[PDB]
Enzyme design. Structure first.
Site, mmCIF file in Angstrom:
data_model
loop_
_atom_site.group_PDB
_atom_site.id
_atom_site.type_symbol
_atom_site.label_atom_id
_atom_site.label_comp_id
_atom_site.label_asym_id
_atom_site.label_seq_id
_atom_site.Cartn_x
_atom_site.Cartn_y
_atom_site.Cartn_z
ATOM 1 N N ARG A 60 0.837 -1.189 0.000
ATOM 2 C CA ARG A 60 0.000 0.000 0.000
ATOM 3 C C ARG A 60 0.877 1.245 0.000
ATOM 4 N NH1 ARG A 60 -1.831 2.991 4.506
ATOM 5 N NH2 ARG A 60 -3.575 4.373 3.963
ATOM 6 N N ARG A 107 -7.962 21.673 5.941
ATOM 7 C CA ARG A 107 -6.770 21.941 6.734
ATOM 8 C C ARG A 107 -6.832 23.351 7.303
ATOM 9 N NH1 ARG A 107 -2.761 17.935 7.533
ATOM 10 N NH2 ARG A 107 -3.347 16.207 6.143
ATOM 11 N N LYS A 251 -13.007 3.805 0.597
ATOM 12 C CA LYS A 251 -12.762 3.951 2.026
ATOM 13 C C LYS A 251 -13.904 4.734 2.660
ATOM 14 C CE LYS A 251 -8.354 5.123 2.885
ATOM 15 N NZ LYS A 251 -7.408 6.295 2.870
ATOM 16 N N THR A 309 -6.266 -0.239 10.159
ATOM 17 C CA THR A 309 -5.809 0.830 11.042
ATOM 18 C C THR A 309 -5.693 0.379 12.501
ATOM 19 O OG1 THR A 309 -6.499 2.639 9.582
ATOM 20 C CG2 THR A 309 -6.348 3.112 11.894
#
Ligand SMILES: O=C(c1ccc(NS(=O)(=O)c2cccc3cccnc23)cc1)N1CCN(CC2CC2)CC1
Ligand SMILES: O=P(O)(O)OC[C@H]1O[C@](O)(COP(=O)(O)O)[C@@H](O)[C@@H]1O
Ligand SMILES: O=P(O)(O)OC[C@H]1O[C@](O)(COP(=O)(O)O)[C@@H](O)[C@@H]1O
Ligand SMILES: O=P(O)(O)OC[C@H]1O[C@](O)(COP(=O)(O)O)[C@@H](O)[C@@H]1O
Ligand SMILES: [Mg+2]
Ligand SMILES: [Mg+2]
Ligand SMILES: [Mg+2]
Lengths: 511, 517, 514
Positions: A60, A107, A251, A309
């Protein structure tokens, strides 16, 4: 007896659990694929060779960081390590390359300087282009103007991996109160729990990175922050006609994605349960509900699902995982995940190979502990009737393998589809898939129980001889790999003519 | 939707029942074989042609009565009727011939008055059951002689003795040297040489009579396909039947008739050594209480279903049709529930041997069976047969369960199987697919014998082998397809599962294919 | 070893069937109620005493024939036989009386006992010409339903006299239907006609029906079997004809034709229960389909928690023979296994030569079949199909059935005024007998419609303290069960009672040892 077979013929799930035996050793091959994230701890050719031998099936690339040249040399190193084993075709293990997109992001602005946002104080979230650099203790700039319009009064804004929480008290920028305070740096991530984020399915950086992926021949894209089918349409269109054969794994990372899951799964090749960002966007104590739901639905659809994760997080620094981590990997397998994943454990940690070895061991044990009786019955009852001969043959071959406790099902496939239809019914027997397509041999790692063998010999003059040669290649590769032995029974799945889509034959053969 | 498919997709057995629909018409061919007893009402060639056309699959010869010459002419007439259809090979129906043995018997004596004489046994009176040979011809109202001496050690005080098909009942009052002093519980008129039943007693009869040995040799000599072995109590009884058939009759199937308490209690041991079972409810209902027979039936069929061996439900299924053109509600219910219980075959006795409506009796059993086959709850049945069947390394059985699973997956109209002995078709039938199991064979005897297995439709292939074996396999599969098309069971666009083997000869079945018609 | 308990603990239905044992003897009392049709063979008080002792729970009066005074005599004789046992209160068995209505009919013409033979293969004219009303002969049949000539096409079938005679229409013309005799036989005067597959329009209640229902109300019958119910409006008409004084009478709708089957849901919704009237049904729809109809209707009735009756020809050969055929025993046993609350005898008890023996045979079979029920799967499916409920009577009922299953209770003893608490227990099909103690004579009779409910009529005046009266009724149920053999010392029983007097307050379950 081995492979938890004493527990396999139980009449209840409770009796099944009661009959599991720590002395029943796993005998079948490991079916849950391992995704390893590439980083400084797993970039060198020798290290990647070690990781391939350890059991890594999917490499990945996290495009959240790293230049295009960095990821190109990552690909080069992975491919060199993989092809070092190409000199022995009967033992060669295909390894897939997956591009994990940076994805749409929010952000903050630039204030190594930091400021403290104190609980109980007022903080203004602004999108004035003038505040790009003028961050303050009471002022936060974000590169998402339409933020003003997607988070209501009473809505929350999460900053820096969920460490900072703001609640909108007044709107019109968004005037907020600090619910959970802390120290904020520059250009930290923002999450909007429960909000409809209005970012395109792909950022401009995402477009450039996907063109890079197509140009470098990646097999899979893990598409970040997918909230709807249109996000997957945008990813697929950016991949263009050049990347049509690349698998798209969506995802699911936030509330909208979880709630709109059905429409996402319908247009995706598969799903990744991205538990990190999910646990930032929804309460942490709810993440498992999301996981088991999505895995469940993916199992019903016959599409791959990846649990990801922090599965072995502590192994970033210590040589052995915690009891909770071993439990999490085993329970991801038992939930029904086709693939499990390692992130920092392999990208930057001190024990990448050991983490891969641990996931391999746990997955083998957990796959042996699967209650095939009820799982197969429920998959049978939920999968709709089908007149497609590949699926008819697949369910018949899985039923046959269960009946004779076959060591394997050897299937000929061009695109991988026949092996995937075998895997969707979750057989205990390994599905050995012989193919000439290198990309399909890599992409079928996404489907539990599919063991790819890449056939390289030129076509025989008589197609029937070529079919039989590929079948014997499956047998001899399984024999050499120790998973197939003389006297075993196998189920062999083939088709009546050349070309993909005509699988319709199931045979019972002895070694 | 047809074939009770709405009820087929039910999640519970209760919902399955709730969803049954009298307007849902059956589409599959009738799968439960019909056994018809041959007699005066059904002996002429033309009558037998009518019964074949109506749906008769097995002709039963009752050797309780009739000479060897009578049964030989019966066999010749059945074969003439069957072979009159051979001119159209795609539609020819094989018909099996089953020999039902007389079996060991206990009989009363000849009355003092003489052969054509009768005496009254009065309820509440004293009757001596004696085995003294001096009373052989000395029958009267208070004395009954029997040709079974050990009666005196198998019926204790309190036991019952049945005479003339259960019409007369006796309870033993005391036991002694003269015999059993009994009192008449159920009285009636007694003739000469009537049948005796000893409910709950362990009978010592050989298991095969001398006339039985001879009749079985007549069967081998005339090429019968099946033997219904009467009064089987023992693995030793069926072993004796097997020995009497000799090496020449090794291919004949032995169906053991369970007729008394011993057999039901000894059931597993009989089933282990037999090819199949007949629930002989007539004599069973004399030997055990009538209100218990259904228990035995459901038990035996059940176990036969578990073992993958044929089971036949027998006797009085459409009894009233011996004289009436329509059956009673209980009779139609009985046939339907025999199918639902899991019986592979149903039977007619007086309804076809002597009755006034034999052809109509066959037609009614056909109609009912078709409706009931549609009404099977395949979800639970298949799941339970799967859970109960042991793991197997035999490729024929592995292929069979995969083929049935596939047939269920695609709603296949049929499973077409090549078979030499019938074994591959039987292994398919054991899992009870909804799809017809069309069995193409060159063996005429196997084509006749596979009627014992529910859902197997035999086709006799007659053309010599093609030069290339694979071409011959494909030609037989195509013959199965064209037979199914002509007979109305297959249409263009249907899916079929095709079950073949990797080499010639029996025992190598290992291939399942999914084909569209 | 017994009550088929080895098969009770089976993991699959197939294994359950495999584990059945003819040596496992039934021990519980017989739970399926037996309906006996009253006729010349079963009208004398002495005969009715025999039939009560044999197991008859419900007396059915067939008003298709017979005057009002005849049925009054039947009622008087049944009641005399029933009350002759009242001198032993612990053993007294209540018996219900059900009125079966004549219903709408189509009949042939008048030929008194003159008769004509309709010969198979001959030509027969079916006419509705009013001039041919009294001119019936071997080749001519007149019918009192003019539209017959318009609803039976060429190839259609006409059944005469309970289906004994069959005609198939060959040609249609102004004079009527020229038919051929498919099944011949002897024809009398004014026999019943059935038109399978035809859309027949007939009134929902006849005038004779209104009068017969008034007669039933006036004589205190407990149940009406309503003939030929095809829609909810028919049962509404029956209810209206019973009137404000007959509100307490239970309405069991007889499903006898295609419309009734297709409209089953709406009929069950407005009915107290259902009879699968297989006699007329098997003439109206193809014979080979009746079992489908049967298993469907019983199933839905089980789903609804309403009683269902299986009827007609169950032991038919016992009209003339002392023993039934194997198919008939099978039929009774499978009716019980299907889920029927009641089984029925018609000619077997009304006119046959062995009425008491027919009652005894149904009793024996029903006991055997009840022991062979697969309660594991049956209870689980009824639990998952029955809706969630905040009614304490139903909550308590399912809890008590679960408790009885857990300890193999010999009985569930329930106090009930209307029967409702007993019916809610019965809906879950316990293996344990539901012993229902009531002061209501009519409710004690009516609860026979519910499988497993054994009614006890309590006669003693109330104790001064209500809790003492409850305890005395519970002990009365216990002592009756002991005397009747359903209870022994050491048994466990579940006892279901309520927190205050009056119907509707059942809310207590207790575990007691005998
Ligand atoms: O209607 C039926 C019935 C009978 C046979 C039948 N047959 S079947 O082929 O559908 C079948 C399905 C499921 C398991 C089976 C096991 C062995 C044989 N056959 C089976 C399907 C239904 N009943 C069986 C007995 N109950 C009684 C008990 C629950 C209370 C209900 C009635
Ligand atoms: O799984 P897919 O992609 O449909 O491939 C299955 C195909 O593979 C085969 O077995 C072999 O085909 P090739 O000879 O083209 O490789 C075909 O008969 C069949 O249709
Ligand atoms: O059911 P059986 O008797 O085992 O017969 C199955 C056999 O039939 C076949 O399909 C055809 O064989 P033949 O050509 O010898 O008839 C074999 O391949 C297979 O072994
Ligand atoms: O089943 P029903 O008709 O509700 O009767 C149940 C009633 O019977 C009782 O147990 C006894 O009540 P009574 O004292 O009024 O007879 C009540 O407590 C309960 O409400
Ligand atoms: Mg993210
Ligand atoms: Mg006999
Ligand atoms: Mg009627």
């Amino acid at each position: 007896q081995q492979q938890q077979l004493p527990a396999a013929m139980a009449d209840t799930f409770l009796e099944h659990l009661c009959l599991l035996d720590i002395d029943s050793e796993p005998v079948a091959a490991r079916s849950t694929s391992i995704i390893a994230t590439i980083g400084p701890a797993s970039r060198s050719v020798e290290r990647l060779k070690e990781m391939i031998k350890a059991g890594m099936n999917i490499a990945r690339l996290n495009f959240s960081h790293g230049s295009h040249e960095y990821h190109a040399e990552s690909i080069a190193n992975v491919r060199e390590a993989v092809e070092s084993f190409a000199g022995s075709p009967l033992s060669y293990r295909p390894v897939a390359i997956a591009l994990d997109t940076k994805g749409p992001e929010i952000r903050t602005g630039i204030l190594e300087s930091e400021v403290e946002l104190v609980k109980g104080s007022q903080v203004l979230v602004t999108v004035d282009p003038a505040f790009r650099t003028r961050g303050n203790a009471n002022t936060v700039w974000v590169d998402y103007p339409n933020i003003v319009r997607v988070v209501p009064v009473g809505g929350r804004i999460y900053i820096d991996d969920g460490l900072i929480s703001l609640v909108v008290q007044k709107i019109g920028g968004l005037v907020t109160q600090v619910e959970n305070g802390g120290v904020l740096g520059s250009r930290k991530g923002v999450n909007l729990p429960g909000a409809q984020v209005d970012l395109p399915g792909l950022s401009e950086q995402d477009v450039r990175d996907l063109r890079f992926g197509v140009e470098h021949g990646v097999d899979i894209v893990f598409a970040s922050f997918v909230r709807k089918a249109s996000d997957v349409a945008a990813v697929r269109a950016a991949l263009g006609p050049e990347g049509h054969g690349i698998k798209i794994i969506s995802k699911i990372e936030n509330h909208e994605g979880v709630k709109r899951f059905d429409e996402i799964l319908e247009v995706s090749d598969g799903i990744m349960v991205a538990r990190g960002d999910l646990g930032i966007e929804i309460p942490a104590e709810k993440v498992f509900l999301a996981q088991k739901m999505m895995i469940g639905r993916c199992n019903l659809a016959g599409k791959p699902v990846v649990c990801a994760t922090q599965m072995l997080e502590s192994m970033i620094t210590k040589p052995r995982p915690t009891r909770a981590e071993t439990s999490d990997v085993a329970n991801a397998v038992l939930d029904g995940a086709d693939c499990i994943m390692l992130s920092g454990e392999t990208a930057k940690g001190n024990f990448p190979v050991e983490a891969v070895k641990m996931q391999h061991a746990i997955a083998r044990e957990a796959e042996a502990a699967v209650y095939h009786r009820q799982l197969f019955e429920e998959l049978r009852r939920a999968a709709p009737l089908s007149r497609d001969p590949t699926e008819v043959t697949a369910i018949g071959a899985v039923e046959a393998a269960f009946k004779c406790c076959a060591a394997a099902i050897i299937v000929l496939t061009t695109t991988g589809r026949s092996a995937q239809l075998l895997s969707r019914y979750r057989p205990r027997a390994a599905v050995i898939a012989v193919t000439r397509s290198a990309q399909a041999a890599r992409q079928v790692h996404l489907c539990r129980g599919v063991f790819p063998l890449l056939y390289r010999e030129p076509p025989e003059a008589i197609w029937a001889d070529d079919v039989d040669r590929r079948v014997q290649f499956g047998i001899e590769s399984g024999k050499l790999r120790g998973f197939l032995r003389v006297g075993d029974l196998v189920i062999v799945v083939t088709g009546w003519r050349p070309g993909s889509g005509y699988t319709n034959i199931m045979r019972v053969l002895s070694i």
